[PDB]
Symmetry: D2
Subunit: 119 residues, 4 copies
């Protein structure tokens, strides 16, 4: 619920995710990327199950790779589950999609998986 | 286009996505196949389609499916505007079942 | 159907898949958009579509793209038989770039 | 090349994969599953880049979940790269597809990632 999720997290590549879980199931924050065309901080928005069922808490968020300094013409979404305890982790799968011409659309989307550790 | 995106859309199975695209890159609206709140972002200065993504947690006042889907794709405008997507649906699971927690698929939305 | 699967198929972009389905569950054949060898398996006793998958390493006598695609899906027979798939294309990369090694997409093949 | 790949491997869930890499780029072997409707050994087939480029070697394989004892009406494909050294590993992403009725086709496919360690 709010506090579990709210906080600073890092993935296995050294990117940072700062998130506030709101009472209505809203997720807002900032993302700072360890890779790609990514310079500085980017806004993030998402949603989580604010009334979860030993099972994890399902959540997802999106970043569009545009800030006041750069624009990668691409957006990533991460879908996963928050698993609490002392070992708090967020286990995700993500899709990165770039804006493409129609011809190149077949190769517009990357897929990968990230694990977030809470700090 | 910002307000190119703004509107009501439908996918292949009859689900309906109502969205507003903000000047600064925000997407907000509701998804129904009952109704759920969505939030996302899009490139507000595209070159190419416009990249975008959004999430829906499957909980509202009536049901809680303890899952959340994210759609990642691009908007292509023109005479017949479309949003081509791939999505990941993750369910809250115990550790024993975490390996079978995520479904993947694709959706094509149109104004029709 | 074993020999329901056997035949020549085309996807949305004009690639052509020539396949033979063996009695015991083997798939063999070639894929061309030049030609590459494919191998896979399918459920030879289906209930529902027939589950199946195949791989193509993108190397032949003429080119080597140092990648390999796998297609996972099901065969649906009837008047207009189709093979609905999702695929993963992985490229051989250095460790620095391993996070951007895999493309995901979907393909629909038909006899037309 | 052949020998690098050829051998016995296990994933993080305790499944086993026994594979022989052939000279023409063929992969044949057997898979024994730690989960699902999966009883005993199942045949596998796939392909690999027999002439790879510090970069890994791209490969993929499929198992249909049918043997003489069980049938799950489903097939999985794993796509990834073999990374050699002492730390030999195969890093993959997989798609599991079940045979479904048309109505249920939207939820026929699972996605996940596995890491294989050589034994």
């Amino acid at each position: 619920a709010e506090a579990g999720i709210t906080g600073t997290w890092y993935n296995q590549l050294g990117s940072t995710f700062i998130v506030t879980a709101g009472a209505d199931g809203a997720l807002t924050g900032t993302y700072e990327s360890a890779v790609g065309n990514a310079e500085s901080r980017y806004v993030l928005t998402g949603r989580y199950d604010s009334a979860p069922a030993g099972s994890g808490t399902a959540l997802g968020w999106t970043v569009a790779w545009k800030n006041n300094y750069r624009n990668a013409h691409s957006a990533t979404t991460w879908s996963g589950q928050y698993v609490g305890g002392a070992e708090a982790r967020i286990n995700t799968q993500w899709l990165l999609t770039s804006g493409t011409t129609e011809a190149n659309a077949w190769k517009s989307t990357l897929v990968g998986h990230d694990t977030f550790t809470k700090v």
